[PDB]
Amino acid sequence: STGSATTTPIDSLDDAYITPVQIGTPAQTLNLDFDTGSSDLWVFSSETTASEVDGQTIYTPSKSTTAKLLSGATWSISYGDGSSSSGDVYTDTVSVGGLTVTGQAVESAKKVSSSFTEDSTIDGLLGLAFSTLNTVSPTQQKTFFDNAKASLDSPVFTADLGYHAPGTYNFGFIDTTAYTGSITYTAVSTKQGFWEWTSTGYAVGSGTFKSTSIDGIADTGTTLLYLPATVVSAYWAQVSGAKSSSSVGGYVFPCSATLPSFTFGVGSARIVIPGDYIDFGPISTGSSSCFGGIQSSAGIGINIFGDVALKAAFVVFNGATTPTLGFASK
Numbered sequence: 257s258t259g260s261a262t263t264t265p266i267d268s269l270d271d272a273y274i275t276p277v278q279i280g281t282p283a284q285t286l287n288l289d290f291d292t293g294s295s296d297l298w299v300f301s302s303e304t305t306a307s308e309v310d311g312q313t314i315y316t317p318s319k320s321t322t323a324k325l326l327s328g329a330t331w332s333i334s335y336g337d338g339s340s341s342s343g344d345v346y347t348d349t350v351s352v353g354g355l356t357v358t359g360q361a362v363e364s365a366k367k368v369s370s371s372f373t374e375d376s377t378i379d380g381l382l383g384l385a386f387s388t389l390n391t392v393s394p395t396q397q398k399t400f401f402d403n404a405k406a407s408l409d410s411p412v413f414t415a416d417l418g419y420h421a422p423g424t425y426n427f428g429f430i431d432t433t434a435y436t437g438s439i440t441y442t443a444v445s446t447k448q449g450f451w452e453w454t455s456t457g458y459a460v461g462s463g464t465f466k467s468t469s470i471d472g473i474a475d476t477g478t479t480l481l482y483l484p485a486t487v488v489s490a491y492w493a494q495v496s497g498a499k500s501s502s503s504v505g506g507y508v509f510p511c512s513a514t515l516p517s518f519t520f521g522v523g524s525a526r527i528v529i530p531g532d533y534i535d536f537g538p539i540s541t542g543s544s545s546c547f548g549g550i551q552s553s554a555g556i557g558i559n560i561f562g563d564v565a566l567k568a569a570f571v572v573f574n575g576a577t578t579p580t581l582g583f584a585s586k
């Protein structure tokens with residue numbers, strides 16, 4: 257089997273992407289944030305504290321004839337931005353782009369933090385990291401991909417995120433029309449539960465390529481590109497007036513700037529992120545100070561190839577017995 261679904265930016269900045277997901281019988285369609293940096297499929301629901309729901313579409317398990325309470329199971333998760341959610345668990349039928357999994361753990365939120373409430377466009381998350389990170393207790397649950405894998409034509413999914421435009425998540429096949437040139441595959445460590453790999457270096461604008469190993473994760477659920485402070489300083493040094501602002505929480509630059517591209521290495525291959533992808537717009541409405549799309553990972557503990565990087569590529573998440581990642585230009 258295969259599946260194919262369109263993923264759409266939630267706003268004009270590509271702050272996140274939402275993908276429609278069918279849950280239950282009859283189908284309830286929710287728009288979920290597909291997140292290769294986590295491993296829980298959780299949703300706003302009829303159980304979510306009422307004051308914490310503001311415009312999201314909710315899953316109502318009592319209206320699904322295939323929903324079953326997973327007795328005794330609970331979940332609780334915290335994310336890198338300080339947000340969090342928790343609740344109980346149902347199993348139900350879940351379909352993405354025509355690919356159906358029966359008995360999928362659907363984690364129903366009883367509580368969500370303010371940032372989730374405040375974002376009316378995201379109805380929940382669909383985790384696509386390794387199932388070892390799943391938070392359900394006392395019995396850990398599998399991701400949608402892990403559950404689907406054995407049925408897929410090939411044990412893979414692909415992310416093809418758009419810049420200020422829709423893109424595609426495919427399951428079970430590689431669309432050879434969706435990229436240019438070849439796909440370069442690189443080793444993955446699953447030791448931390450992530451799609452963790454090592455980039456071979458970087459270049460800023462038209463500058464020379466610096467060969468250096470940068471370990472990081474391919475994370476569709478993170479907006480920006482988080483890299484070592486040395487790399488990030490080298491980038492922003494090429495933008496007149498750019499500086500790190502502790503009050504804003506990262507590098508900012510004059511909105512009048514033209515940003516240089518940023519290249520990252522995948523083996524001997526190179527992925528070029530155009531400068532415009534690195535502009536996240538005014539820091540507050542009407543400001544002439546703009547927020548940068550490349551930021552330091554120093555406070556985080558891990559480098560993160562978030563949407564800024566991934567959207568510049570066609571990315572293969574190869575879930576074969578020894579997983580790997582593939583990157584192509586597009």
Ligand SMILES: CC(=O)Nc1cccc(CN)c1
Binds near residue numbers: 289291371479
């Ligand atoms: C408030 C909100 O939507 N946070 C979120 C979503 C998806 C992933 C992560 C972690 N990178 C955080």
